[PDB]
From Swiss-Prot, chains A, B:
Top-level taxonomy: Eukaryota, Fungi, Dikarya, Ascomycota, Taphrinomycotina
Localization (cell): Cytoplasm, Cytoskeleton
Full protein name: Septation protein imp2
Span within the parent record: 15 to 311 of 670
Organism annotation: Schizosaccharomyces pombe (strain 972 / ATCC 24843)
Function: Required for normal septation. Involved in the disassembly of the medial ring during septation.
Cysteine disulfide links: none
Length: 298, 298
């Protein structure tokens, strides 16, 4: 005996019928919870991306020089690259994760419509025949019961009331044939309906088991996709960080200081103190600052 | 000739003196710009973490079953772990990156007060001696021009006008010898002051260059730290994703469905159709629902 919905969702009152149908709302509930969860997770990522992009738009002054200035620019460009990545990730979190639940809820609605329709008609007919069977069985039952009574009256009745009784008895006996006939027809019709019901519910159970099995594969894959997206985000950001470090590694402080000196130098000549100007040896005061070239060791 | 601050920041008007001193203001503004940048970056990270922790506090319904139910909890728990990680990272960004500039700013301020202390006095003495020189220089040549006036008017003059003239000539000629010595004394003093200034400014230059070198090593170090922190964040999140994937790998859909069937089964008995009970001969309904156990294949 196989372990499937086909063999384990029956019951004397179609318990499996009402159960598996009502489960559709539980599946929908679970699906909506996760959609809502990942909806927020995506917006969190988007906001993060947006703020990081805004930060990348920061303008610095022109006060820094050399490769150190370049490093700040590279760093800002790479923070921007991280923003772009996170924005792309948030978009995928919405489209491939969040919206996957949305597309599932839309698909499930159609699946339920197709399944519920093609089984509730069969079920309604099953109950319809069964009602007709009980109604027919009852008529035939209490007709036989009246015959029993009318015969028992023959022992104590007399006169015109005995013949009136025997008239009722005779009329009731002739009703038995048709009543028994309609009853047996009701038995036959209910048998066929049950036979059709057994086959149809089996078919429905197979389809309902498919949905459940696909549901669990779906939920696993989406959560899997979620981790793939975040791991990708980590790879991207780490690569950006590595590029910042590579740029920093190539940034020589001593070379920067050299270039700083060349660009900011104010003079290599040391001003000499003013000398004595003897009025008599033709000497005359001048303003030309004598310069002696600096020649110190660091 | 070494390429150092000590050899390249002179100039006839002490341009290098004023340039390297106002340099402190630029260095401070660069540091503040970066501090502000990483403050926002740390802030973005903190908001990210806080919002992600709030999300992981979501409560899901207990409608889900099996390993899948466990996987959803593992997923949400690892989302929680990522939030905690991003929170600590934001704290380290604040204390080790952002606050690094704050610690540097304090040390730079106290360092500046010492450089400015030991050089501004020396510079004023240079300017003070120079003012004393130009004043003595002017007095000397003004007297020389005046002795020259009375001399050129000698032969042109006569008697009592000559005597009045020559009297002012003697008084002036006398003063010239004295002012010439004061002029020379000033020249001697100024050359001493310029010598001290030269030796002191080169010393200060060497210190200022140490500061500039220190500064560039510092900013690179803090940027480096920034990348290590983000990379560490990437690592933690990726590990969290791995752990989620380890759990999904071990979760079996088949087993979940098998356990679902076991828990939710509503019966294995197929209800059989009601039979015809010949009431007319005393055949009484056995109101039992005959159950033929299902044996369908999947």
């Amino acid at each position: 005996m196989d372990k499937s919905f086909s063999n384990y969702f029956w019951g004397a009152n179609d318990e499996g019928y009402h159960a598996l149908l009502s489960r559709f709302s539980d599946v929908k509930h679970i699906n909506e919870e996760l959609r809502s969860f990942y909806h927020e997770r995506a917006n969190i990522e988007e906001d993060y991306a947006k703020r990081m992009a805004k930060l990348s738009r920061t303008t610095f002054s022109s006060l820094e020089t050399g490769c150190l200035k370049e490093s700040v620019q590279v760093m800002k460009a790479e923070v921007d690259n991280m923003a772009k990545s996170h924005l792309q990730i948030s978009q995928l979190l919405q489209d491939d994760v969040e919206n996957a639940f949305t597309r599932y809820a839309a698909s499930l609605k159609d699946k339920k419509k197709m399944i519920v329709s093609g089984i509730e008609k069969v079920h309604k007919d099953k109950l319809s025949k069964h009602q007709a069977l009980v109604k027919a069985q009852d008529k035939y039952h209490y007709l036989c019961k009246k015959v029993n009574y009318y015969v028992s009256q023959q022992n104590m009745l007399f006169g015109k009331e005995l013949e009136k009784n025997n008239a009722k008895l005779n009329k009731t006996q002739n009703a038995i044939t048709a009543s028994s006939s309609d009853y047996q027809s009701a038995v036959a019709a209910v048998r066929d309906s049950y036979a059709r019901w057994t086959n149809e519910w089996r078919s429905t159970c197979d389809k309902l088991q498919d949905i459940e099995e696909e549901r669990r594969h779906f939920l696993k894959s989406v959560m899997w996709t979620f981790t793939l997206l975040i791991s990708r985000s980590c790879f991207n950001d780490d690569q950006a960080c590595e590029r910042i470090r590579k740029n920093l590694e190539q940034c020589s402080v001593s070379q920067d200081v050299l270039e700083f000196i060349d660009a900011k130098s104010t003079g290599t000549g040391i001003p000499q103190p003013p000398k004595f100007y003897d009025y008599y040896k033709g000497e005359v005061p001048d303003d030309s600052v004598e310069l002696v070239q600096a020649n110190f060791q660091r």
